[PDB]
Amino acid sequence: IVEGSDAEIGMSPWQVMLFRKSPQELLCGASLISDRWVLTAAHCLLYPPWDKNFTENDLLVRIGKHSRTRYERNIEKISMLEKIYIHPRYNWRENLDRDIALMKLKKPVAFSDYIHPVCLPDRETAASLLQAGYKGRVTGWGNLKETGQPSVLQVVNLPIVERPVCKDSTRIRITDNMFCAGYKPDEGKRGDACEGDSGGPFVMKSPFNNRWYQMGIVSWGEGCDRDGKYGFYTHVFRLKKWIQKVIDQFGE
């Protein structure tokens, strides 16, 4: 996260780290959506232009963390993956359309003060909150600058941008399965996701029922925190029929 700040303890208890087993390293973010299911970006798991294709046994998920590098004894939990599910229409060749994946854990994780799932939006949630100017929150342990790494989880709040402005910022074809967020040059405030933040959540707190909803997944951007560029996020509600199909077919 560029131009963010340190998270408070327990501020994002659905935050998940994806951790490469060997070499031991941060791969991406993710989010806890139930005791057995973790949501991330497909490009964190499958991206052929970089010879990335992870299988279940290549990875671990770390839940409940605050420190980036510490083993947080008696706080974090480390879970093994049973199975990865990537959206069958994930478009890695062109623009990362449908950049979404699910990971089923081998065993359920116990909730705690530090480990708790986020809600997924329904149609009305999305209609009420996904509006230009409304702010959401992005969290992660990715880099602090485009060209180091944080001691603790970072957080930044960012406004959703008008679709024609998002489209006019890039040569990439923007689909209805994406939205963008970030400040405009003239707004003077700053912030963005950066390398290592991908797969993490973009959340909003409903003012109607006081709950946090994951509206987006950190998907892609053109550099980090560049003036006139925006971050792009997978539109979770637009892909919920797939989410539910997978959990309904394979959950226990």
Partner: peptide, 10 residues
Amino acid sequence: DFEEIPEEYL
């Protein structure tokens, strides 16, 4: 750079 995690997890 990352602190080593318990062996049981690997």
